């Protein structure tokens, strides 16, 4: 009791000061978790935005490939058109020579 | 008329023989075009079958990627689980030593 | 004499347990900051990931622009080709 009275006094505030050092940290994690959920929402939205553009590039390659197979036909038709019909005409119209 | 009578006779069958050589060829192209359309139907059906398997491989890669990001989490959880909780327990249960 | 030699027991409990425990609270602050800084690193990565795929779609859009540009001025070449055929096949009207 000679020296104990102080240790009761001293360690109550040592308890009390750390009694509000816990509330401060609790509010620190409850704001650091909210800042985590803001980041999760952004990345999730940006994860789906990237996914939308993924089949946007896929439909483009579906357009490219089918827009090439058409030119493969137009070049093929011009072979018979410009090559056979035209040259034979001018070879048939060689009568003037 | 002395020699012309034959040329009338001869060139009618020369016409007539080639009059049924045209029907034969007409039936030859009308059967060679049908054999072309059998091939078009097969390749068109096999073009779509290949296309169906194309997004079948695409959905598989969508399964693979998302079945990896789950293992990236389970391996991450085991870090805190097997590493922190377990080792600290046995380091806290070192009291017997 | 009695209530003070005992009441220190309920006081040391806070000072010893919370001294170590609040450190575990501090580690979570670093951990939740590490999680925050890791996702923040990813967000810059995905914006760069957006950037390349932003240009990739634009390059695809120019490829469609160039491809239809061929067709637009390759069907025109066929338009004049059939005019040449019909004009030349109009010449045979003069004879037959």
């Amino acid at each position: 009791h000679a020296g104990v009275d102080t240790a009761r006094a001293t360690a109550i505030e040592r308890a009390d000061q750390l009694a509000k050092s816990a509330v401060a940290q609790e509010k620190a994690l409850k704001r650091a978790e909210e800042r985590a959920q803001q980041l999760r929402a952004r990345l999730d939205a940006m994860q789906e935005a990237q996914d939308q553009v993924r089949r946007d590039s896929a439909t483009h390659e579906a357009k490219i490939a089918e827009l090439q197979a058409t030119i493969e036909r137009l070049t093929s038709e011009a072979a018979l058109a410009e090559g056979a019909l035209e040259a034979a005409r001018r070879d048939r119209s060689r009568l003037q020579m | 008329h002395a020699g012309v009578d034959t040329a009338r006779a001869t060139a009618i069958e020369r016409a007539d023989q080639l009059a049924k050589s045209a029907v034969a060829q007409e039936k030859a192209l009308k059967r060679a075009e049908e054999r072309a359309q059998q091939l078009r139907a097969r390749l068109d059906a096999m073009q779509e079958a290949q296309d169906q398997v194309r997004r079948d491989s695409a959905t598989h890669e969508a399964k693979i990627a998302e079945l990896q990001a789950t293992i990236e989490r389970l391996t991450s959880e085991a870090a805190l689980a097997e590493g922190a909780l377990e080792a600290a327990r046995r380091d806290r249960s070192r009291l017997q030593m | 004499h009695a209530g003070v030699d005992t009441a220190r027991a309920t006081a040391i409990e806070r000072a010893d347990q919370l001294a170590k425990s609040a450190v575990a609270q501090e580690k979570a602050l670093k951990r939740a900051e590490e999680r925050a800084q890791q996702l923040r690193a990813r967000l810059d990565a995905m914006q760069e990931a957006q950037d390349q795929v932003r240009r990739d779609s634009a390059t695809h859009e120019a490829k469609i622009a160039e491809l239809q540009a061929t067709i637009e001025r390759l069907t025109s070449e066929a338009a004049l080709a059939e005019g040449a055929l019909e004009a030349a096949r109009r010449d045979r009207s003069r004879l037959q």
Epitope: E66, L67, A69, T70, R73, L74 | R40 | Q68, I71, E72
Partner: nanobody, 99 residues
Framework: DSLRLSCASS????????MRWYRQAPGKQRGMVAV???????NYVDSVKGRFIISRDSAKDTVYLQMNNLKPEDTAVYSC?????????WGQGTQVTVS
């Protein structure tokens, strides 16, 4: 006077590349008349240019060749063409007799 032709496609809703119109003059060979494309680029042959219009209707899966200010020279069997996946598809055809 005036006429109009259609080419009822059985697929390719808006996936429409080149779809063009062919006439086979009676006793002559096939020839192209007008060409339409997915972007709507319409280009005609000189013999019809300024007289005909090739107009798409992407909603109803049909292409349209408006016929205007005709001549009895236009009496011919008119048939439609279509390119999809490279393959060229024709149509059974309809006969147009003008005189």
């Amino acid at each position: 006077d005036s006429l109009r032709l259609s080419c009822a496609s059985s697929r390719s809703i808006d996936g429409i590349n080149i779809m063009r119109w062919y006439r086979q003059a009676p006793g002559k060979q096939r020839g192209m008349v007008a060409v339409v494309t997915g972007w709507g680029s319409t280009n005609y042959v000189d013999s019809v240019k300024g007289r005909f219009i090739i107009s798409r209707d992407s909603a109803k899966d049909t292409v349209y060749l408006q016929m205007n200010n005709l001549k009895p020279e236009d009496t011919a069997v008119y048939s439609c063409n279509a390119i999809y996946r490279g393959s060229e598809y024709w149509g059974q055809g309809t006969q147009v007799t003008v005189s």
